[PDB]
Amino acid sequence: MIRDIIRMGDKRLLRVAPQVTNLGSAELHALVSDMFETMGAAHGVGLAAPQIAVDLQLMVFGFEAPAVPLTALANAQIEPLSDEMENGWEGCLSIPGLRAVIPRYRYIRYRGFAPDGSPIEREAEGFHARVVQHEYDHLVGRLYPSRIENFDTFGFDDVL
Numbered sequence: 001m002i003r004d005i006i007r008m009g010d011k012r013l014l015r016v017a018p019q020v021t022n023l024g025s026a027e028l029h030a031l032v033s034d035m036f037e038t039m040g041a042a043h044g045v046g047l048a049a050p051q052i053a054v055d056l057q058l059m060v061f062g063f064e065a066p067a068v069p070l071t072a073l074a075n076a077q078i079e080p081l082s083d084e085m086e087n088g089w090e091g092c093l094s095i096p097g098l099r100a101v102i103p104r105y106r107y108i109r110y111r112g113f114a115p116d117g118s119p120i121e122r123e124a125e126g127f128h129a130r131v132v133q134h135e136y137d138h139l140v141g142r143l144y145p146s147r148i149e150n151f152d153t154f155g156f157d158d159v160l
């Protein structure tokens with residue numbers, strides 16, 4: 001079922017989310033399936049549960065069309081594997097119509113759980129890594145405008 005995505009300005013995007021504790025449940029399977037459908041209708045590559053006003057450590061991401069594997073990730077934890085940063089374009093479904101250039105870690109490891117309870121641990125780079133970092137920020141109440149360094153790159157998609 002498609003859910004409403006809340007927009008920047010909503011206090012619900014500024015929370016730090018608690019852990020998922022119903023791995024393998026029907027309830028969690030239903031929420032994940034709704035998040036994939038939601039992400040798909042909005043033409044996203046990532047979506048975090050706080051963006052649909054669900055206060056949990058849970059994100060979906062991915063796309064066929066470099067491809068990033070379709071993933072649902074609960075209780076994520078991330079770590080940089082070097083200090084190397086890379087600039088790239090980002091937008092956000094809770095900030096419709098805008099983009100900016102944002103520095104992120106080029107290389108990371110992330111760990112958490114698939115909805116069925118299986119552990120997930122992967123090394124990621126480039127675009128894969130960026131998506132994960134961007135969604136992770138939602139879980140700790142951060143949006144990308146707080147990370148812009150060059151405000152000349154912040155603007156409307158149709159205009160830039």
Ligand SMILES: O=C(O)C[C@@H](Cc1ccccc1)[C@H](O)SCc1ccccc1
Pocket residue numbers: 043044045046047048051089090091092093094130131134135138
């Ligand atoms: O709003 C979110 O939290 C989901 C974003 C994820 C994103 C993260 C990093 C870089 C780009 C996007 C939305 O998917 S934005 C739509 C989009 C689609 C393809 C390429 C770029 C942006």
Ligand code: NI
Pocket residue numbers: 040041043
């Ligand atoms: Ni469509």
Ligand code: NI
Pocket residue numbers: 091092093094134138
């Ligand atoms: Ni976002």
Ligand code: NI
Pocket residue numbers: 125
């Ligand atoms: Ni490589």
